[PDB]
């Protein structure tokens, strides 16, 4: 059966043959409607209303609604349907609604999240949403009651619930969708034109395609209208899946196992929706201050002598960099928890030299543990202890450990979901730290990557390894570049918990960090990610390529991870794969200075690409130094945004639409971004370019370098950015805290502080500032910090300390206040502490050309309150 109207509307057709080229026979065989088309974007075979479920009996509970569902008895799709299914609603908060669909007569796999708590009460009354549930056929419908706009409309297609194929579709109210990962999107706002996005954790070079990559994030967000009203949709399921987007727009989930567990999250602004999502899934970890310093790295330095030569040439070029990373070449025959005693002879002395300069040292750690013997024939202690404690992932029998292959040849895999394994791991890092004093860890190969397909002895041929429906994952082969789908772990079968491996290792390393650096924050950088891995680790965008495309795409990739609540994120500056250009790398170093996580990294064999390799008096070194210096100056501001992220769930690097949603031009913009609300970063992203077409939003902007008020507002301009400049603007209405830069955060942190006041329209400005020791894990939780509020109006600045419980912070002071965009010239400056009367201040400069005032040599000590008048 087909729609009564002959020339029906095509954008509402839900594809009935999603895995294969449509044929009339298979269409009929599935009981769907056959009606071919001029192109092959539009489905030729679609369920009109032929598949689905009906409600028979539904009741009310205190929390929401239970409903028993029965399969409308159409033919099967991929077999093993479940005829009798249970729908459950939970009105969790006034802002988030949750529904789930389960098998009453069997406990199906449910993601064993480590933060998402079970909900039972209390009952929330007066919610912002409204849930209508159609009866025949079943469909859910979520409505914003405020204005009656319907957000999530299941009525548009069937529910298909079979043992290995799950399908539900939803009509959305606008054409603006953001998120889903990890893939290369290229553009921040989604193309709606019939696109599949496969999600399944996987080791793969990011390129121009829809391949599933390192992380598994199902969250997407959507802006309803010009008032900023938005919502988000998160599906809690870790099986392989496709998310399909088509015009109207109707998004469709096709998933290979588990249950359907949806959360729908309302907000007043896009910023609020992202906050709501992090509330549910976990707020991001607060980083250590030194995490924000610049990092140098490469795969295969070959020897400690080359590492040394790189460090000293960069120190000499005056490049600010806090940390030195060291890839698998530091290890002995690429074995975890060892170091090459020959080519990396003298490592602990070198580590000592780093610490002597106030620098830090990060090592890579892979999950795979070698079955082999050490160099001089001795038993490999890590492997031996692993056996003793039975730490490994077993084959389908549940006894024999599975054998893959990674860097050191054949290997076994730790089951980081085992509480014994987390102990073993923590122990290994503790033992190793006594030999080599690392400062932080970088966990790689997280996806569970294997160089061989499946296992050392291949895969058993079954429904788990060769499922009835495979989504568009690379190679269309589940066990490709990973382990057998029937492998057993403590949380479950590989088929179910595959995408959770990287997640669990981040958790395991967060414990390991507490054993090694008691009560410190350290550093954990992870590759694979699941929902709310922000809570445990930092992420970088993987193995990119020295390529202008790839540099452009990193912005929209970084902004997506901001949505996913992993704020400490960056790409590999200058390009991992391939040799980089002087020109490309000069530009990427400018942009890279403004990634939340800022690190230059390179692949094996290609020429060096660290800044100082391009020449001590090179334009690249001059530029990089200048902008890394700007970065370091702004670190107090950045760090404060990270505090706000950790506490309220705000974004650090945010897209322009988050602040300027009243303008529909901001909705599509993704070639520039912001640090929080105040700083606008506009990079050069085309080869050879001298100029860039930039959309400058609806506010007052000041050039960061000069301080001059730009004559631009709510318009597109041709911004002139020569070989050494990158667009930096401060937004009027904001006060940002800065601190005199140095070449390490260690050194910079004891330097005098300062404020920048970008005045805005009504001659107002607001700002905040958070300061602690930047490393102790529980400072926020124990009230051991300083917190400030800034306020300007009537040509007078108020510095208000709202909390003060950190003694070593009292020694620092704001000693410099720069005020941009003055309406009238200045004669006298007066300064008062607390509420004492104001004395005159001599040291100041007024520049009538730029309307800039800079007040020098003050002594506004952290801890106390002050006023400054001009
Ligand atoms: C930053 O700088 C400005 C200085 O301009 C200060 O704001 C002014 O505040 C004063 C009082 O401190 C205001 O003066 C009074 O305004 C009344 C109008 O009140 C409403 O509207 C104003 C402006 O929109 C609001 O600010 C205010 O809250 C009210 O909502 C007048 O009616 C008053 O006049 C009285 O006397 C006249 C005769 O002289 C009679 O006609 C009336 O009956 C009445 O009795 C008075 O003028 C002033 O309006 C504000 N300025 C402006 C232009 O907005 C801020 O105080 C300062 N910031 C700080 C915190 O110091
Ligand atoms: C994989 O197999 C190992 C060994 O075959 C299992 O280890 C058992 O673990 C418990 C608790 O650590 C011990 O008391 C037993 O000594 C172990 N059994 C034996 C016979 O060695 C392990 O549980 C299996 N792992 C998973 C998750 O399947
Ligand atoms: C496709 O078919 C429709 C309906 O018959 C028609 O209106 C449309 O123009 C066709 N497209 C092309 C490319 O001819």
Curated annotation (Swiss-Prot):
Boundaries of each P-type domain copy?
1-49
Positions of the UniProt region annotated as Isomaltase: 49-870
Question: Record-annotated residues binding substrate?
Answer: 203, 327, 527, 601
- List the active-site residues: 444, 543
Q: What is the effect of changing residue 56 to R?
A: In CSID; missorting of the enzyme to the basolateral membrane
Q: At which residues is glycosylation annotated?
A: 38, 376, 394, 762, 794, 843, 865
Disulfide bonding pattern of the chain: 2-33, 16-32, 27-45, 459-484, 574-585
Which positions bear Sulfotyrosine?
176, 178, 330, 339, 606, 702, 704
From which domain of life does this come?
A: Eukaryota
Q: What is this protein called?
A: Isomaltase
**Gene name, Swiss-Prot/TrEMBL:** SI
Specify first residue, last residue and whole-protein length for the fragment: 62 to 931 of 1827
């Amino acid at each position: 059966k087909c729609p009564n109207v002959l020339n029906d509307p095509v954008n509402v057709r839900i594809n009935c043959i999603p895995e294969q080229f449509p044929t009339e026979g298979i269409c009929a065989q599935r009981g769907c409607c056959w009606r071919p088309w001029n192109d092959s974007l539009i489905p030729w075979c679609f369920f009109v209303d032929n598949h689905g479920y009906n409600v028979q009996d539904m009741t009310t509970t205190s929390i929401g609604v239970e409903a028993k569902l029965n399969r409308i008895p159409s033919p099967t799709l991929f077999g093993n349907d479940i005829n009798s299914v249970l729908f459950t609603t939970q009105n969790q908060t006034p802002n988030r609604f949750r529904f789930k669909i389960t098998d009453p007569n069997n406990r199906r796999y449910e993601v064993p999240h480590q933060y998402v708590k079970e909900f039972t009460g209390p009952t929330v009354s007066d919610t912002l949403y409204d849930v209508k549930v159609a009866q025949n056929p079943f469909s859910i419908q979520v409505i914003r009651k405020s204005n009656g706009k319907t957000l999530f409309d299941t009525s548009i297609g069937p529910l298909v619930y079979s043992d290995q194929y799950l399908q539900i579709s939803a009509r959305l109210p606008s054409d603006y969708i953001y998120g889903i990962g990890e893939q290369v999107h290229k553009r921040f706002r989604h193309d709606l034109s019939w696109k599949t996005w496969p999600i399944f954790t996987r080791d793969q070079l990011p390129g121009d395609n829809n391949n599933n990559l390192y992380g598994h994030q199902t969250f997407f967000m959507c802006i309803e209208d010009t008032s900023g009203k938005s919502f988000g949709v998160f599906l809690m399921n870790s099986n392989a899946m496709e998310i399909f987007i088509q015009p109207t727009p109707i998004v469709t989930y096709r998933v290979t196992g588990g249950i359907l567990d949806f959360y729908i999250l309302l907000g007043d602004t896009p910023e609020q929706v992202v906050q709501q999502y992090q509330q549910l899934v976990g707020l991001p970890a607060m980083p250590a201050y030194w995490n924000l310093g610049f990092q140098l790295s490469r795969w295969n330095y070959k020897s400690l002598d080359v590492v040394k030569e790189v460090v000293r040439r960069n120190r000499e070029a005056g490049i600010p960099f806090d940390t030195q990373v060291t890839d698998i070449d530091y290890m002995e025959d690429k074995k975890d928890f060892t170091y090459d005693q020959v080519a990396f002879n003298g490592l602990p002395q070198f580590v000592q030299d780093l610490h002597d300069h106030g620098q830090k040292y990060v090592i890579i750690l892979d999950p795979a543990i070698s079955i082999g013997r050490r160099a001089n024939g001795t038993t490999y202690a890590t492997y031996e202890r692993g056996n003793t404690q039975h730490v490994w992932i077993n084959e389908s029998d549940g006894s024999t450990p599975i054998i893959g292959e990674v860097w050191p040849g054949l290997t076994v895999y730790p089951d980081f979901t085992n509480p014994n394994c987390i102990d073993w791991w923590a122990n290994e890092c503790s033992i190793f730290h006594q030999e080599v004093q690392y400062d932080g860890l970088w966990i790689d190969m997280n996806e569970v990557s294997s160089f061989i397909q499946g296992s050392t002895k291949g895969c058993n041929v079954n429904k788990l390894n060769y499922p009835p429906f495979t989504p568009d994952i690379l190679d269309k082969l589940m066990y490709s570049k990973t382990i057998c789908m029937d492998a057993v772990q403590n949380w479950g079968k590989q088929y179910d918990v595959h995408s959770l491996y990287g997640y669990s290792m981040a958790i395991a390393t967060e414990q390991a960090v507490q054993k090694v650096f008691p009560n410190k924050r350290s550093f954990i950088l992870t590759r694979s990610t699941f929902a709310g891995s922000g809570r445990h680790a930092a992420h970088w965008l993987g193995d990119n390529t020295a390529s202008w495309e790839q540099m452009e795409w990193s912005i929209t990739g970084m902004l997506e991870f901001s949505l996913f609540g992993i704020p400490l994120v960056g790409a590999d500056i200058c390009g991992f794969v391939a040799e980089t250009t002087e020109e490309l790398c000069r530009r990427w170093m400018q942009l890279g200075a403004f990634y939340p996580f800022s690190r230059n990294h390179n692949s094996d064999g290609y020429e060096h690409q660290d800044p100082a390799f391009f020449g001590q008096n090179s334009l690249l070194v001059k530029s990089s130094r200048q902008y890394l210096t700007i970065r370091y100056t702004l670190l107090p501001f950045l760090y404060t945004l990270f505090y706000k992220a950790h506490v309220f769930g705000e974004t650090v690097a945010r897209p322009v639409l988050h602040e300027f949603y009243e303008d529909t031009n901001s909705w599509i913009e993704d070639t520039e971004f912001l640090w929080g609300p105040a700083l606008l970063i506009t990079p050069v992203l085309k080869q050879g370019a001298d100029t860039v077409s930039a959309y400058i939003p609806d506010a007052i902007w000041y050039d960061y370098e000069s301080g001059a008020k730009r004559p631009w507002r709510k318009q597109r301009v041709d911004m002139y950015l020569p070989a050494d400049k990158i667009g930096l603007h401060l937004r009027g209405g904001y006060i940002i805290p800065i601190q005199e830069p140095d070449v390490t955060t260690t050194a910079s942190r004891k330097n005098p502080l300062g404020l920048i006041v970008a005045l805005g329209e009504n001659n107002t400005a607001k700002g905040d500032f958070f300061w602690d020791d930047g490393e102790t894990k529980d400072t926020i939780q124990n009230g051991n910090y300083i917190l400030y509020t800034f306020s300007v109006s009537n040509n007078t600045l108020d510095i208000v300390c709202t909390h003060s419980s950190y003694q070593e912070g009292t020694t620092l002071a704001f000693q410099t206040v720069k005020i941009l965009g003055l309406t009238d010239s200045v004669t006298e400056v007066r300064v008062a502490e607390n509420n004492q009367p104001m004395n005159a201040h001599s040291n100041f400069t007024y520049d009538a050309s730029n309307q800039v005032l800079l007040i020098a040599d003050l002594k506004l000590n952290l801890g106390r309150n002050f006023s400054v008048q001009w």
